[PDB]
Amino acid sequence: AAIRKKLVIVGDGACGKTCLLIVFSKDQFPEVYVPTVFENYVADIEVDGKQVELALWDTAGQEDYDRLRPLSYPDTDVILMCFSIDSPDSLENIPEKWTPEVKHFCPNVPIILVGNKKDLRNDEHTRRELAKMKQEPVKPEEGRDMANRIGAFGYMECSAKTKDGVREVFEMATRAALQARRGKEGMLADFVSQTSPMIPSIVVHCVNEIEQRGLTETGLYRIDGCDRTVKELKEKFLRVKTVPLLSKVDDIHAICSLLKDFLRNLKEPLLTFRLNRAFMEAAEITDEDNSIAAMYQAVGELPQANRDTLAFLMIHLQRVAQSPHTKMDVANLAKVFGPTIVAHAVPNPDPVTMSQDIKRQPKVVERLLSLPLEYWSQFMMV
Numbered sequence: 202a203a204i205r206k207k208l209v210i211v212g213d214g215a216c217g218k219t220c221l222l223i224v225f226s227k228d229q230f231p232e233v234y235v236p237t238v239f240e241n242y243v244a245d246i247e248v249d250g251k252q253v254e255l256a257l258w259d260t261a262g263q264e265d266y267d268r269l270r271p272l273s274y275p276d277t278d279v280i281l282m283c284f285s286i287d288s289p290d291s292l293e294n295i296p297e298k299w300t301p302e303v304k305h306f307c308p309n310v311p312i313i314l315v316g317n318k319k320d321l322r323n324d325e326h327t328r329r330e331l332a333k334m335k336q337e338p339v340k341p342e343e344g345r346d347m348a349n350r351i352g353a354f355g356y357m358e359c360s361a362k363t364k365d366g367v368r369e370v371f372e373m374a375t376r377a378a379l380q381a382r383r384g385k386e387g388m389l390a391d392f393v394s395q396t397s398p399m400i401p402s403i404v405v406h407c408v409n410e411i412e413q414r415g416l417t418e419t420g421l422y423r424i425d426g427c428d429r430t431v432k433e434l435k436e437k438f439l440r441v442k443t444v445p446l447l448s449k450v451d452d453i454h455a456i457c458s459l460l461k462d463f464l465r466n467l468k469e470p471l472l473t474f475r476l477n478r479a480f481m482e483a484a485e486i487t488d489e490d491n492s493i494a495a496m497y498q499a500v501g502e503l504p505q506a507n508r509d510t511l512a513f514l515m516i517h518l519q520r521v522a523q524s525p526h527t528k529m530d531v532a533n534l535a536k537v538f539g540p541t542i543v544a545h546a547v548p549n550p551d552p553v554t555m556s557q558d559i560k561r562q563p564k565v566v567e568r569l570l571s572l573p574l575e576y577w578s579q580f581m582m583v
């Protein structure tokens with residue numbers, strides 16, 4: 202019988218985690234632009250005379266899944282912690298976000314630091330784009346240095362697109378696994394404007410900034426900004442009370458992350474605890490006409506502040522989906538916003554409940570985003 206090992210992959214959204222797992226397990230490079238929520242794969246590998254069956258646990262890199270991701274950590278044998286060579290920001294998040302999370306939930310589990318998209322290091326288009334932000338591709342020595350800094354078992358670079366170095370990543374992860382076991386915010390109402398349309402200033406400002414500087418950017422809302430930058434912006438907002446000067450933030454993705462963070466951390470979700478189940482049930486109705494009618498009914502039950510803020514957000518997200526540059530259609534946006542605006546029916550649900558809710562959240566957002574622009578616009582009085 203083969204030796205079984207559990208491998209969990211983590212890292213910033215869109216840094217290449219799924220493509221790496223699929224190229225290795227299926228020998229085929231996925232061409233679609235779709236964010237992962239949670240998926241499981243199986244791959245075989247022969248290492249040091251042993252046949253090993255690797256269970257590959259794919260996860261979402263978005264901050265929106267910070268509360269749900271830990272459900273994947275129990276019994277992990279090795280972690281693949283990734284960043285992309287064409288994204289210095291994704292490397293910055295390795296010691297700032299990923300290492301603290303993994304060491305908390307997976308103490309003593311070996312970590313392989315992986316630099317993805319190696320094929321882009323000398324890509325001129327990539328270099329020109331990074332230069333606009335005064336950046337450049339990550340250098341090999343930087344990856345190795347970071348690996349030593351975080352106590353990783355090793356560092357490996359690869360390109361799922363060219364297949365270069367892919368098996369080596371899993372060979373090292375498998376050896377690490379074998380060696381390690383050898384011999385062993387208040388309520389929304391407190392932030393909104395005085396009357397209809399009742400929306401928080403931070404939401405209006407973020408949306409306006411994003412529509413001004415982000416509709417031509419690939420992966421809006423899928424790509425998170427530097428964890429530190431978002432934390433600083435959030436800290437200032439809640440302390441100074443006024444919205445920070447967003448025009449001074451060079452990375453528009455950080456503004457997207459700020460908006461999602463604000464919404465996700467409200468005392469209760471945008472759709473409220475009281476209607477959480479009603480929304481999920483309405484979206485789960487098989488018959489489209491009946492589902493749509495049930496969703497209109499649920500929206501009509503929301504408090505004014507929640508309805509107006511939701512309407513403003515839906516109009517904005519429809520524009521994001523309609524842009525030919527973002528590659529973020531309704532289905533993609535629903536996957537990212539599910540935990541952020543739907544969330545759960547209680548403050549601290551148990552793991553069983555958290556898991557049960559996962560599949561139900563995106564459906565709610567997809568249904569809401571599919572409601573007519575004319576419908577949402579009435580609440581904006583335009």
Ligand SMILES: Nc1nc2c(ncn2[C@@H]2O[C@H](COP(=O)(O)OP(=O)(O)O)[C@@H](O)[C@H]2O)c(=O)[nH]1
Nearest residue numbers: 214215216217218219220221318320360361362
């Ligand atoms: N150039 C290049 N692009 C890649 C590579 N791997 C993934 N990508 C692209 O990066 C984007 C996100 O990939 P994906 O694996 O879905 O990201 P994930 O959110 O970490 O699972 C997609 O456009 C992929 O085609 C790579 O090795 N080289």
Ligand SMILES: [Mg+2]
Nearest residue numbers: 218219236237
């Ligand atoms: Mg993925």
